Amino acid sequence: GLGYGSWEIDPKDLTFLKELGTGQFGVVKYGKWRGQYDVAIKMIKEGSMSEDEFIEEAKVMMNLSHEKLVQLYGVCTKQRPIFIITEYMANGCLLNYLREMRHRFQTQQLLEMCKDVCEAMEYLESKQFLHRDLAARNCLVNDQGVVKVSDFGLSRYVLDDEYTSSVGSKFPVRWSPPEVLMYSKFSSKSDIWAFGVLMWEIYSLGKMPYERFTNSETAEHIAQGLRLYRPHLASEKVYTIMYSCWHEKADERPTFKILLSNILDVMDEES
Numbered sequence: 001g002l003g004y005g006s007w008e009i010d011p012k013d014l015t016f017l018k019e020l021g022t023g024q025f026g027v028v029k030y031g032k033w034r035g036q037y038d039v040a041i042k043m044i045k046e047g048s049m050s051e052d053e054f055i056e057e058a059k060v061m062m063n064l065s066h067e068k069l070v071q072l073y074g075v076c077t078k079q080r081p082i083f084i085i086t087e088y089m090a091n092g093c094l095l096n097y098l099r100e101m102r103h104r105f106q107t108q109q110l111l112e113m114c115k116d117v118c119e120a121m122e123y124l125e126s127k128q129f130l131h132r133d134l135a136a137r138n139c140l141v142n143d144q145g146v147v148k149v150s151d152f153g154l155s156r157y158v159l160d161d162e163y164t165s166s167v168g169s170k171f172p173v174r175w176s177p178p179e180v181l182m183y184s185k186f187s188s189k190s191d192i193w194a195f196g197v198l199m200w201e202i203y204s205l206g207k208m209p210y211e212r213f214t215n216s217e218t219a220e221h222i223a224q225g226l227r228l229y230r231p232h233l234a235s236e237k238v239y240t241i242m243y244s245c246w247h248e249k250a251d252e253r254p255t256f257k258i259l260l261s262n263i264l265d266v267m268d269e270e271s
């Protein structure tokens, strides 16, 4: 209605039902939009986000529509804290889901999770849109057990310097290729590297990558040309796929289209 652009949701249309938890921008709630539609509501803590830049980017993000991407529905930006309204994913973050041993996952279920994420990433790659912080903690799981990629590009708007540089103390060192750690060279191939690490997280049922090392030690390890090794649940063919994401030379790493093809081939050979 009047006073709201196509990217803008009227907060008066929201019914708040449950608190999901706190993320790095603050509290996230579950609710309904116009009494019927499930939504998640990020409530953005004052001083945590580059809000004007995010709002301009939200316009681009809302047009990134793919079944395996958590949809941005709109933003509430007339008052602080601002809200980001997203698709609701009932089974929570992927990292926590993997760590719940009750699920007793078959490897075919783990490969399907990888395929979900790979499809999202092939879509973003086709739109020349980098995720910039791909990891299991940034994927969500719906009530059907479908995995979707969330928070694509959002690291660009984080004002906490601990997150936004290697000199910072919350930077995703363990998901980063050597050229990011050495030179801050972000590209499609840094997303590819991260996706390999995410496959490793899935097949390890949510272990921390390089779990016995510090971030500094991890940086040195990968700079010496050394890598993660094979999760017990990963077949030889699955391991080859994740390992292909870690070529020292970025231009030798596959595309998301190639990875998707490889993952489908393994699904065919292993089901």
Ligand SMILES: CN(C)C[C@H](O)COc1ccc(Nc2ncc3[nH]c(=O)c(=O)n(-c4ccc5c(c4)CCC5)c3n2)cc1
Pocket: 020, 021, 022, 023, 028, 040, 042, 070, 086, 087, 088, 089, 090, 091, 092, 093, 140, 150
């Ligand atoms: C019961 N117990 C064991 C699980 C906890 O109760 C956590 O349950 C949860 C968490 C998230 C969801 N679903 C959802 N759906 C769309 C989201 N969109 C966002 O932008 C967004 O930022 N989060 C989110 C992402 C990560 C985290 C939170 C929110 C809260 C802390 C971690 C979204 N979480 C469901 C259930």
